[PDB]
């Protein structure tokens, strides 16, 4: 009923960390569940370390991509604490086909589809890239715009006023756009390269059918979530933490309302969920990719992650 799928990916394992003296802590009872500290967590799918990039994309994103090319909206969330493998899962290696993670594979599927239609279909792809930072909407493609707003049009379709829309005509133009924006996202520092905001990448695929003169329009949102911080330097990083946690809780409330089939879903309680209202719940398709470390050293954070993912399971 909810249309939301939660998928948990576990990472290997690496040499540097085996030499520190860590245990694997994660046990699997089938395609379903991960068991950590004797507690079971069931999801829509659990990927162990042997699961390839391509098969993660196939399970998580491929049919969402098809649906947007058929005129639907969709959303993919990436959640994980640092070193959970969130970036390997979402981006991977640029031009490596085995290889590349979810986002470049999406871009590759879209343009293959386009190239294979050629005659019959005319495409215009608009991309946007912005972050939710300290509850402000900042454009990552134009840093001069640091405080945008969300609105609804006449048919209650959400839009970000003033956000940069770039036309793109090839996979390279798309990845370039991603890179420009990454260079502007708020990161920091006792972890390391720690996102201090949520990022939203929008792929808007507009179609016109040559033969029939009929238009199609689909929105695909790629949301990279900053991890919840258990922070009590009591200054700007504090404000960052409290905002990250609130927005995650607001998202979790909506996610949970949808998963439990609530007749009222509280989209209004945060800027992100207002932005995502036509692409999260209803006839939209969503995958939540939560990334976890197997390491014993990470055990409480992957627990934090798993429980957040559970807010979304029916």
Author numbering: 6 to 194, 197 to 239, 243 to 324
Article excerpt on this structure:
Kinesins are a family of microtubule-based motors that play important roles in intracellular transport and cell division. Kinesin-1 transports cargo within cells, a process tightly coupled with ATP hydrolysis. Whereas kinesin-1 in solution is mostly loaded with ADP, ADP release is accelerated several thousand-fold upon microtubule binding. Here we characterized kinesin-1 P-loop mutations that interfere with ADP binding and determined the structure of the corresponding mutated nucleotide-free kinesins.
Using these T87A crystals as seeds, we were also able to crystallize wild-type apo-kinesin-1 and the T92V mutant and to determine their structures. Whereas most of the following analysis was performed taking the apo-T87A structure as a reference, identical conclusions could be reached from these wild-type apo-kinesin and T92V isomorphous structures. Taken together, these observations suggest that the P-loop destabilization in nucleotide-free T87A, as well as in the isomorphous structure of wild-type apo-kinesin and of T92V, is the combined result of ADP release and of the loss of the T87-E236 interactions. Whereas we demonstrated that, in the absence of microtubules, apo-kinesin-1 may adopt two conformations, ADP-kinesin-like and tubulin-bound apo-kinesin-like, the effect of tubulin binding is to shift the balance between them and to stabilize the tubulin-bound apo-kinesin-like conformation, from which ADP is released and which is primed to bind ATP6.
